[PDB]
Amino acid sequence: ATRKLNEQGHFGPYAVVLSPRLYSQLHRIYEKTGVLEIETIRQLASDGVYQSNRLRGESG
Amino acid sequence: PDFLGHAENPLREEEWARLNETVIQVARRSLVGRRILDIYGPLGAGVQTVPYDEFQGVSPGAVDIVGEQETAMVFTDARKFKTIPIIYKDFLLHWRDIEAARTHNMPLDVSAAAGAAALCAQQEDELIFYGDARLGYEGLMTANGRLTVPLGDWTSPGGGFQAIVEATRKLNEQGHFGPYAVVLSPRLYSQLHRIYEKTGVLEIETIRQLASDGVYQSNRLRGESGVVVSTGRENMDLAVSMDMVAAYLGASRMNHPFRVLEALLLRIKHPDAICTL
Amino acid sequence: AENPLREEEWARLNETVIQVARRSLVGRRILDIYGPLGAGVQTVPYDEFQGVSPGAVDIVGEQETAMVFTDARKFKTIPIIYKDFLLHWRDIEAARTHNMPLDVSAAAGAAALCAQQEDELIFYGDARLGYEGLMTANGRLTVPLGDWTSPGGGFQAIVEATRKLNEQGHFGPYAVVLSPRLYSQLHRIYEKTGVLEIETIRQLASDGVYQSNRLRGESGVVVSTGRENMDLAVSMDMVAAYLGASRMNHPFRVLEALLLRIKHPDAICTL
Question: Which Pfam families match (chain C)?
């Protein structure tokens, strides 16, 4: 998604909104070493990764 | 010209302060109900009755260019007020112990105070989580419209997540979603607290991220059950008339028995935000 | 037949005893004490337990349920624990003129022995005299601490101990005391991701996980740190006193007067 934004010449500090199912289940803590997968996504986004229960099941 | 008699309060000021501090702190330690819920502020001793609003409403808001929806949400027939009970225990303190704590060995012992207040809070949490038919009250695991969902999948390495997932799905089906909070029985909670789910870390971390208001433990619940609720107001409440406090009943044979008071009543203003086994 | 030391040396001796005490006492970091009652008292009141009275009457007005009180009133005698050492008059004179350390190694040894005896007393009552031992108490809620030396080890036992405490309606901020063998070997750093197993146990307990080399090889306990559950009646804190000169050599004795009164023996788990 970030490379598709950048290809379109539209970048910056991104933000992410995920459905609660994923935003909970995404805590697959083991990426490889010690850091939460959601934490590394947040490092990639740099303006938070929020959840909103109003979204559908598998969307973000 | 001494301790004997049926006089008023025997305890001095600082002793009263220590008694009150002990009951308050052991209450704060032992209360799990008053964390998942939220309380209508202390009304006072006098207030014996509080309103008990009717039931659910499937009426949502609406947005139009010019406000004409009329957004009705009206109670229909009555209001069926209810009354606030009381819960208490005993403080059988010896007179010789009080006498010793004046001119002699003086660590005034109030262990019975902490024990009695712990029992009182346990009974109160039993009240919230289970109504008693004698007073005709409603309990979270015995209300009407609990939106039941089977569990039938624990004792497996990872057969606990999908139960709360299904509970959340059913709770959102009624158009009632928000910050969920879960309360579980002791053995169920410990079993949930087991080793990695084979897809990350301990299951309770994922469950706590999914709930967003914590997973709590209650010994007072039955063996193999638990609930998930919507923590906001406009859905549930805990009307408090007066918080835990120790008061002097009377004079026993020669001792002094006390009693700890607190008047609480749960109000399920919206019995849609309850889910169980 | 006199009084040997002046203020400075007395203060140094007392400070050394206090330092070795506060270093070696493990019990004082898990139990809170009943205020120092003075040397006068020798007896204290005792527990209240199995007060099975729901008190959950929950009726407008009030019912007449049973009040909670001591199950059977009785008393216990506060022991005295002491260690004796010796000093030489020539040593004092030398420390007064030639050099000025005033060697107090004997005092440190005495304080260490006294503290070890005290901790053994707390973790094991004296069977001959007859007291209550944390690993020999009645109503101990034993839980099998076995099947360790495994990836998922002490966690599976601590969670079971906590659920047994909570089932008994007795919870709060727990504390854990483990034998040194385990408290070292428990550092099986890999739970799954990055956090010490002892660190996650400490997160579960929330009032420390201490070790005490006085325990046996494969034993450990978990308790509820609050008062009104466990207590430590103190009559006087560890202090050094003078036994009177004999043959010009000055003896000395370090004293402590402690007794634990387990009010609510429901906060116990063992092997």
Answer: Linocin_M18
